[PDB]
C-alpha cells in the first residue's frame, strides 16, 4: 500500500550531465555519444540578456571558447551549431555511459522527473507536470539551466525537457531537445505571461481511483453524470473538459475498481461543488493533477 509522488531512478540521467562554460557564464549540458547539447543562452553575457541577437553573438565565438568538464575530463569540442533553442557541441569522446535514449516532445498533462543539477552535478529528483500552458511549477536556483526532464521506459531514456528559464512569476520555462519552446516563451529577459492555467481533470480521476485502490472511498456518491452535463461543471472550475480518450485510457482503472469512469466523474462533480469539508485523500487536502494515468498503475502494479 501507499502513494507517493515517485521520479524515475536518476542513474541513467547521472552519468551524462557535464558543465559547459562560454566565457564567464556556466550551466548544464547533456553529453549523449559525441554530442553535447545545452541552453543557447550560455553565448550570452549580462548586457545580452534582455535583447539577443543570437546569431551575431555565435558568430563571434570558436570551438576553442566552450569548455566542457565532466568531473576533471575536460572534453576538447571540435565542432558547434545552433538548432533552434540549443547549442549541439561536437565533442572528440563519445559519452562511454551513453543509455538508449530517444527524444520526445510531451503534451501538456504528461508527467516526467527532473534531475535538477549545478555546474553538471545533480543535486535532486523530483516529478512534475507539463501545465496545461506549458509552464512547470519547479524548483530551480540560478545555474539550473540545462537541468532535463525524462522518462523511463524499461532500459530506455525518454528526454522530453530541457530547462532555460524562471518567468517573473516564479514558474519555469524550457525547450525539447530540437530547442523548441514549450509555449510561447522566447530565451530573453523581457516579462512573458503564461495564460490560464488549468487543472488536468483526467489526472484527478486517475488520483481518485489511487485512492479507492488504497483504502479511501468517502467521497464514493450514488449519483452519476453524463460527459456533457460533467463538463459544463468542470469549465466553471477552470478544470480541462474530458474526452472519449480520456475515458479510453481510464478503462484499466475502471476495471480493477470495478468503478465506471461516469460514477468516479459524479463524485469530482460533488467535490468541485461542496469542496473537501477539512476531510483528505491520500492525505492532501486538495485534488492532486500530477499523476497520469499510467503513473497510477505503474505505481500500484511495481513497474520496474
Ligand atoms: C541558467 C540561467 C538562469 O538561472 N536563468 C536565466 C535565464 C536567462 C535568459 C534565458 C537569458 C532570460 O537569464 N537568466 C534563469 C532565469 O530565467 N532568470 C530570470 C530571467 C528573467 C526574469 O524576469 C524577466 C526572471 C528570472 C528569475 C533561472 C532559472 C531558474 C532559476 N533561477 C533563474
Given at each position: 500500500?501507499g502513494?507517493?509522488?515517485?521520479a524515475?531512478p ?7 550531465m ?8 556556466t550551466l ?9 547539447y545545452?541552453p543557447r543562452?550560455?553565448?550570452?553575457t549580462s ?8 546569431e551575431?553573438l555565435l558568430?563571434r565565438?570558436s ?13 576538447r ?8 533553442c540549443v547549442?549541439?557541441?561536437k565533442?572528440?569522446?563519445?559519452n562511454?555511459?551513453?543509455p538508449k535514449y ?7 498533462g504528461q508527467?516526467?522527473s527532473?534531475?535538477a543539477?549545478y555546474?553538471?552535478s ?13 509552464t512547470?511549477k519547479?524548483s530551480?536556483?540560478?545555474?539550473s539551466?540545462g537541468?532535463?526532464?525524462?522518462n523511463?521506459?524499461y532500459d ?7 530547462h532555460?528559464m524562471?518567468?517573473?512569476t516564479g514558474?519555469?520555462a524550457?525547450?525539447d531537445l ?7 516563451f ?9 495564460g ?7 489526472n ?5 481511483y ?5 483504502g479511501?472511498r468517502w ?6 453524470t453524463?460527459?456533457?452535463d460533467?463538463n ?13 480518450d480520456?475515458v479510453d485510457?481510464?478503462?484499466p482503472?475502471?476495471?480493477?475498481t ?6 468516479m466523474?459524479?463524485?469530482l462533480?460533488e ?5 473537501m ?8 487536502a486538495?485534488?492532486?493533477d ?8 505503474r505505481?500500484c502494479?511495481?513497474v520496474?
Open positions: 500500500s502513494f507517493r509522488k515517485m524515475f536518476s542513474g541513467k540521467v547521472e552519468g551524462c557535464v558543465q559547459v562554460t562560454c566565457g564567464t557564464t548544464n549540458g547533456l553529453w549523449l555519444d559525441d554530442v553535447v545545452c543562452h550560455v553565448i550570452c548586457e545580452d540578456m534582455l535583447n539577443p541577437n543570437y551575431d558568430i565565438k570551438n576553442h571558447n566552450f569548455l566542457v568538464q565532466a568531473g576533471n575530463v575536460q572534453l569540442v571540435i565542432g558547434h551549431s545552433m538548432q533552434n547549442l549541439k557541441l565533442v572528440d569522446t563519445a562511454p555511459k551513453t530517444k527524444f520526445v516532445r510531451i503534451q501538456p508527467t516526467f527532473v534531475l543539477c555546474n553538471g545533480p543535486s535532486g529528483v523530483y516529478q512534475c507536470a507539463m501545465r496545461p500552458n506549458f512547470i519547479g530551480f536556483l540560478n545555474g539551466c537541468s532535463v526532464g525524462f523511463i521506459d530506455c531514456v525518454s528526454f522530453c525537457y530541457m532555460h524562471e518567468l517573473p514558474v519555469h524550457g525547450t530540437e530547442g523548441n519552446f514549450y509555449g510561447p522566447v530565451d530573453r529577459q523581457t516579462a512573458q505571461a503564461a490560464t492555467d488549468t487543472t488536468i481533470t483526467v484527478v480521476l486517475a488520483w481518485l489511487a485512492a479507492v485502490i488504497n479511501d467521497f464514493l456518491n450514488r449519483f452519476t453524463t460527459l456533457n460533467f459544463l461543471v468542470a469549465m466553471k472550475y477552470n478544470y480541462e473538459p474530458l474526452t472519449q480520456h485510457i481510464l478503462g482503472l475502471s476495471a480493477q470495478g468503478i465506471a469512469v461516469l460514477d466523474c459524479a463524485s462533480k467535490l468541485l461543488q461542496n469542496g469539508n477539512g476531510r483528505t485523500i491520500l492525505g492532501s486538495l485534488l492532486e500530477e499523476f497520469t494515468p499510467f503513473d497510477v498503475v505505481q502494479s511495481g520496474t
